[PDB]
Design a protein around this ligand. Sequence first.
Ligand SMILES: O=C(O)CCC(=O)C(=O)O
Ligand SMILES: O=C(O)CCC(=O)C(=O)O
Ligand SMILES: [Fe+2]
Ligand SMILES: [Fe+2]
Lengths: 341, 341
Amino acid sequence: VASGSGEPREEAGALGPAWDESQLRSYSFPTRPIPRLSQSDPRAEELIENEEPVVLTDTNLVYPALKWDLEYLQENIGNGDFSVYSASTHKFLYYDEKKMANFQNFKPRSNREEMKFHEFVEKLQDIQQRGGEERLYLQQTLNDTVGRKIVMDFLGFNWNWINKQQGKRGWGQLTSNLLLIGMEGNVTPAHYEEQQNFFAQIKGYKRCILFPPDQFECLYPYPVHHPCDRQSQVDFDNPDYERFPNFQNVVGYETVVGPGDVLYIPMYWWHHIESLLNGGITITVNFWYKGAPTPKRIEYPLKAHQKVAIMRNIEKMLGEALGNPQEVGPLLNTMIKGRYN
Amino acid sequence: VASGSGEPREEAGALGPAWDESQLRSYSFPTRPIPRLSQSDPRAEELIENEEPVVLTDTNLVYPALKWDLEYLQENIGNGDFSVYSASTHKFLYYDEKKMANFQNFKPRSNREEMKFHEFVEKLQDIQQRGGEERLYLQQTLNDTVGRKIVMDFLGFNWNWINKQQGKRGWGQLTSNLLLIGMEGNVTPAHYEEQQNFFAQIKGYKRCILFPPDQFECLYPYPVHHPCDRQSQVDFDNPDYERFPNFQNVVGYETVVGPGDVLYIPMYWWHHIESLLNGGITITVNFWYKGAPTPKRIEYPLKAHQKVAIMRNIEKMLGEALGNPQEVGPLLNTMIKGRYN
Ligand SMILES: O=C(O)CCC(=O)C(=O)O
Ligand SMILES: O=C(O)CCC(=O)C(=O)O
Ligand SMILES: [Fe+2]
Ligand SMILES: [Fe+2]
């Protein structure tokens, strides 16, 4: 019951296992599977209602994007600019650029490079043609600049289903759809979002490991003013148990998504996302929504995400009040040592 | 220059030393003297302006109370009720009774007993008449119930001088005058107030050891929701250097006040106050004032007292937001461990 993603699934038409376990990276912690359910299944509505993750196998959320692949996209996506992240390791740590002002003892290991889609397909082409070690990850918000066919594709997504979802959950407005295109083996390490997320897998296979918000103590997010806010400081490949002792208690929910699957990633759930090894390129489109309004007014006992939201707001104000985010830590220490520990 | 209170002072009319060093308790930390100045001395106005302590030797702030002693007071103070604190040790730790609700794993070592002045003089009389170990400390806000002569005494205090002080400093309104009557050897252990304080010594001799607000890290105040809020957790007689390691770095300002001296105790300065051993009873009246309005608006770098005020407000809100003061500590810990330490 520390199973993981379970035995792989059998493709339709006897096409053999979609993937196998040697495509999965190995970690220090155990996992239990996220349930794969039909969208008509009351249990799946239960999970989303309760803000627990679920993999919906038949939404058709992005049915028209299933034909997408690089040739189609290059052909049809337009000449807009695309954010492409670079890296020498498999782990793409994200940096918030606005936050980089107030941390100088920071340098990147992943640079954003703006480029046209064909330049991406191309940069992508040079690297394989020469066996390079390097890696790229395109991640760009879909918007109005995109070509006529992609727009027809987009309009054909299952808005009726996801709008009913937005409605039933009291969510706010859709903030963005991000288009993600990755190389095999790319990892987006563990982090959380403040939005609700339907994560709609289009091409290839991604393993998604989620941790609930009550595992905050085991995952050690960066300081809120740090550029890696909301990301774990823990290197999942080489965990430093002396700095991060509660990582030894972390327990995850795990699944592998393929073409057609939608993974509900609930607000504040940590997620770690890796494109299978030797699985080829992956494509995904996500759907971020604001999140229902905080109830006027509060009921106890608070949920884990609400305690998180509180920690963030304390860090933020202290940032403002002290005039400088760098003084947040010494102040907090002074506040607890010999007082609350 | 770790001098302390200096060589004792010589009473007028060759009456020999007012007190001597064997009347002073001994502690683990060093001290430098607080300056004793005349009220007309520009340097004394400098210190108060800068919120540094100073002992003013000639204010006449409470000239008419200098004749006070127990017989006079019993005779003249009326039949109102007087708060009298009790104790088996020399250290009178104060408890805030409103706060006792939310800490049950608390019992007192100092009970407030309401009683008439003559009952105090009397309880006081039984104990000496029989050589008891016990101790009392009367501490009661002067108010309208007091007898005609005490009121004449009070009206004769030097309002012209202290009102000019209130005015020059932009202080708010006088909140209370507390009347303190102690037995020789009584200690009010280290704590801070949020008000400004002119501490006006009337009978006997008190040693006052002050620490500036920037020594917060060395003095380990109780949690703000604890009943001993604003008091040091450190036992000055037996300091626990394992829980309170920064106590080994504490440095104090020290003085001995006698009849006629006024000690300015600035807002947020820690003070520890002991009535000299074998010095007899002490009498003091203080004058608490609100404190100038926080500037609209803030200028950096912040002063130590302002960082303190911030720590308090964080603890308070977290108290409110979590629904329970008991959860403040675990939350703060979760926030810093592996994150800010
Ligand atoms: O696919 C990825 O690697 C990133 C996905 C993600 O973090 C998200 O959709 O919130
Ligand atoms: O005289 C004492 O022991 C207490 C005085 C004091 O703490 C004050 O006036 O703020
Ligand atoms: Fe994410
Ligand atoms: Fe005090």
